[PDB]
Write a structure and sequence with these properties.
Blueprint lengths: L7 H6 L24
């Protein structure tokens, strides 16, 4: 794993590259057992 601006950004890029595993799967929060808390 990485957490630097040079790498986490790449991880970010992979989060939004297709997003097929994240795209309001995690971020929407309303869909994770309704937890926007």
């Amino acid at each position: 794993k990485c957490n630097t601006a040079t790498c986490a950004t790449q991880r970010l890029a992979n989060f939004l590259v297709h997003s097929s595993n994240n795209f309001g799967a995690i971020l929407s929060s309303t869909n994770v057992g309704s937890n926007t808390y």
